[PDB]
Amino acid sequence: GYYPGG
Amino acid sequence: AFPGQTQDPLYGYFAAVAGQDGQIDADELQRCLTQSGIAGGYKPFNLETCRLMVSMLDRDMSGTMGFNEFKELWAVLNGWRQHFISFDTDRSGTVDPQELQKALTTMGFRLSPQAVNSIAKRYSTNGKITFDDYIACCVKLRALTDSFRRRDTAQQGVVNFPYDDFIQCVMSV
Ligand SMILES: [Ca+2]
Ligand SMILES: [Ca+2]
Ligand SMILES: [Ca+2]
């Protein structure tokens, strides 16, 4: 989860 | 992995940053991202953000960053930059606590607004979060939330943490 989730 | 990757245009830059051992450590990365200017200003690019990136992009459990990992790093930073710009709705070059609350909600986090405000102050001097710190904050939140979720087998929003598990889990991000 090192990428943005929005 | 791919010895002929020396022909990739990014390779020279990678190799200069990596230096003698042909791998990038977080201190080397810190210097790179600082001198790249991506965070803007004059402050160093946060070392903790560099350590999180080295750890999370690691493909071979080497604890260091190689060329394919460095290539991915730039794509990841570009994604975060877009995400940052998008929640910086007054174009201040910083994310304030109200902007952060929206960002985190939009990412699917469900946090106490007071806690968000406290977190924002913990990652800034005056509530105004710079790019490097925005990444650190958001990545740490995701990592801790993920860890909690994995232990919350009943999905009841409460985890029994033995001390050893608590320390190892928290001290690792
Ligand atoms: Ca090196
Ligand atoms: Ca590696
Ligand atoms: Ca702003």
Author numbering:
A (entry chain D): 12 to 17
B (entry chain A): 26 to 198
Copy the relevant paper text.
In CaSor, Ca2+ is bound at EF1, EF2 and EF3 and it is hepta-coordinated in a classical pentagonal bipyramidal configuration. EF1 and EF2 are coupled by Gln48, which coordinates the EF1-bound Ca2+, whereas in EF2 is hydrogen-bound to Thr89. The binding of calcium to Sorcin promotes a large conformational change, which involves a tilt of the D-helix with respect to the G-helix, with EF3 acting as a hinge. The analysis of the CaSor structure reveals the presence of an electron density peak in the cavity formed upon calcium binding and the consequent tilt of the D-helix. We fitted this electronic density map with the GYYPGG hexapeptide belonging to the N-terminal region of Sorcin (residues 12–17). We can exclude PEG binding to Sorcin structure: the Fo-Fc and 2Fo-Fc electron density maps shows clearly the presence of a short peptide containing side chains with a very well resolved proline residue clearly visible in the structure (12-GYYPGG-17), belonging to a different dimer. The residues buried at the interface between peptide and Sorcin are: Met78, Met81, Leu82, Glu97, Ala100, Val101, Gly104, Trp105, His108 placed on the D helix; Phe112 on the EF3 loop; Thr131, Met132, on the EF4 loop; Val164, Arg167, and Asp171 on the G helix. Trp105, Glu97 and Arg167 form hydrogen bonds with Tyr13 and Tyr14 of the peptide (OH Tyr13-OE2 Glu97 = 2.78 Å; O Tyr13-NE1 Trp35 = 2.74 Å; O Tyr14-OE2 Glu97 = 2.90 Å). The residues laying on the D helix play a major role in interacting with the N-terminal peptide; in particular, Trp105 establishes a strong stacking interaction with Pro15 and is hydrogen bonded to the carbonyl group of Tyr13, determining the orientation of the peptide into the pocket which is opposite to that of Alix in PDCD6 (see below).
Each monomer of Sorcin homodimer is formed by two domains, i.e. a flexible, glycine-rich N-terminal domain and a C-terminal calcium-binding domain (SCBD), endowed with five EF-hands3031. The SCBD can be divided in two regions: EF1–3 (residues 33–134), which binds calcium with high affinity, and EF4–5 (residues 135–198), which mediates dimerization.
